[model samples]
Target: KEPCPPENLQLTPRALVGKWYLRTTSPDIFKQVSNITEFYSAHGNDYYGTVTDYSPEYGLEAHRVNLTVSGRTLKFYMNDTHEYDSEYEILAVDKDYFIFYGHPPAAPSGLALIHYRQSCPKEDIIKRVKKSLKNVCLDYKYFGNDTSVHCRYLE
Candidate 1:
C-alpha cells in the first residue's frame, strides 16, 4: 500500500463551503479589525474565499484567497497567486466545524473555526471555540470573534 488513507478529513462542498467567523489568528495582525467573516465557495476542485475584515476605524476591506485539498492537506494561495502556497493539515472537520494545523514551516499558528450555516452560535460551539483558540494562540490574544451584526451569512 502507498500509505494509510485519511480517515476523518472532509473534502466535500457541503463540508467545505460556508461562512466561518473569525476565531483567532496567531500573528494577531488584526487587532484593529474588530471582526472578520471568511466566506468560502467551492468551484471545481479548488475553493475561493472572500475575507471581509471590518474595523470601526477602517470600516470593511476585502481580500481574496484560494484553496485546494488533497488527502488531509490543504493549500492556501493569496489572490489566486499559484506561485506560492501555504499548506495546512486538516486535523478535524465536519459540515459544521473544522480544525486545521498550519504547516509548521509555513503558517505561524494553527487555525480553528465553527460553521454557522444559519442562526447564531450555540453555547457549546462558543465554548469549544474558546477552548480550541486557547491552544491555537497560546502566546497572545487574537480570537477575533463575531456578533450577529457582524456575522451576516454571505451569499
Candidate 2:
C-alpha cells in the first residue's frame, strides 16, 4: 500500500496538527528504547512545530520540527538541519487504533510496523491509549534489556 488513509482520519493537511507520542519500542539500536513522548500542537497550514520527549531512563529531549502531508503520507523533519525526522505512512485506522509504517528518525533503526491506541474517550482515562511500539517477541529493538513503552495521544 503506497498511502493508505482511514475514513476517520481528519487529514489535517499538516502533520503537526495533533499531539503525538512515539514509543520507540524498536528492538534494535539507536535508542528511544524507553518510552519517549512527543507532544505536537498545531493547527491549519503552519508547517512548523516543536517536540518534547523524555523517558525515565533518558532525560527530557526537545526538537524543532517542520512537516508536510500529502494525501495519507506524512513527512516530518526534526529540524532545519535537513535531517530526516520520521515518516508515517498510514496503514490502517480502526475505532480504537491506527496502524502505520514508521521510519525511525535516527541511526541503527529502520522502517518498523508501529501502532497507536485511540485514547480519544475523554475524562479520567485520559492516557486512554497505550502505545505498543515494541513487538518484543518479534522486534529486535526490545530484545536488549529495554522495557517496552506504550504511547498515548492528546487531543
Candidate 3:
C-alpha cells in the first residue's frame, strides 16, 4: 500500500532546471556539509548536477547527483553504483516551494525538507511549511524530534 496519495503538482523540466535552496530540514547532523546547496540542469529525461557539501572533514564535497521525478516521487539513482541511491516523495510542490521526504522501506523515517525555488520564500509561508514538516516528522518519527531548523540559502 502507498503511504501518501500521488503528488499532483504541475511539475516541469523547466521549473526544476534552475536552483532549489534548502529551506528547512530536521536531523541537524546533515550540517556536516555546511552551506548545503543543490543545483539541477536537465539532461535528457534525467538531470545532472552537483550538491555542495562544505565540510571540515571533506572540505566541500561536490557529490554528483542525478535524479528524476516520476509521478509524485523523486527517484534518485546513482550512476556508478546501482545500490547507492535514495528516493523521495514529492508530498507538496508548487512553482516557488516544494516539500519532499525520504520514501519508505529504505528510509521510512526520512526527514522532510521544505525547499524554496531560489531564495527563501515569504517568512509566513516558511513557517507554514515548517509546521507541516514538523507534523509529518512526528508522525513518522524522523530523528525523534519533530522540530526543524531553516538552512542558510546559498544560491
Candidate 4:
C-alpha cells in the first residue's frame, strides 16, 4: 500500500511561501542532485516557484514551477509547458520542515521527500520528522540525503 497523508491536515497556502531545502529523497534520480533548493512565492491565489540544484549530468540547473494546493495534495506544473509535471501528498509540515509522498512525472512508483526551512535542521527536529514518516508506514532507510551545502539558491 502507498503511504498516506496525515489526517486532519491544516495548512494555509501562505505558510509555504518561503525557501525550502531538500534534505532527503527516495528517488534515485534525485540522489544525483545536490543542494536542491526551492523558492516559493504567492501571486494572488496562485503559487509559483523555482528550483535550483546541481548534478553531474546537468551541472547547475534552475527551473520555474507552478503549484496548485488542494487539501493535502499539491500538484506541480512546469511553467514552460503548463502541463502536469508531478504531484505530492503532503504528509507533514511545520515551521522548520516538510515531508511528502511524491509522484514524479511518468513514474509508476511514488517516492518520499523531506525538506527543511534551513539547510541543516536540528537533530531533534530531524528525529521527529523521521518518526512522522514511520507513523505513516514510510521507511526512512530508503531515503538518501542530498549532498551537503544545501541552501544554494540562484542569485
Task: Pull out the clashing pairs in model 1.
Answer: none
The candidate maximizing lDDT is 4
Local distance difference test, candidate 1: 0.53
What local lDDT score does residue 79 receive in model 2, on the 0 to 100 scale? 68
TM-score of 2: 0.49
Model 1 TM:
0.59
| lDDT measured at residue 155 in model 1 versus the true structure, 0 to 100 | 9
In angstroms, the error of model 3 at 63 is 1.8
Model 1 misplaced stretches (Cα beyond 4 Å): 1-7, 26-29, 55-59, 80-85, 103-120, 127-155
Top-down TM-score ranking: 4, 3, 1, 2
All candidates: TM-score: 0.59, 0.49, 0.66, 0.84
As for TM-score, the candidate ahead, 2 or 4, is 4
Q: Which window of 10 residues has the lowest lDDT sum in candidate 2?
A: 128-137
Task: Highest TM-score: give the candidate number.
Answer: 4
Give the per-residue lDDT of model 2 (tens digit) for 1-155: 12233355445443444554443223343254344334555555446666564545756666788656665667777763433467766544334344455555453244443333321323332222222222212332332322343223232
Model 4 weakest 10-residue run by lDDT: 146-155
Deviation of model 4 at 105, angstroms:
2.6
lDDT of 1 by residue, 21-88 (tens): 55444433345554566788888668888877676666677779878877667787766233225676
Q: What C-alpha lDDT values do all the predictions have?
A: 0.53, 0.44, 0.55, 0.73
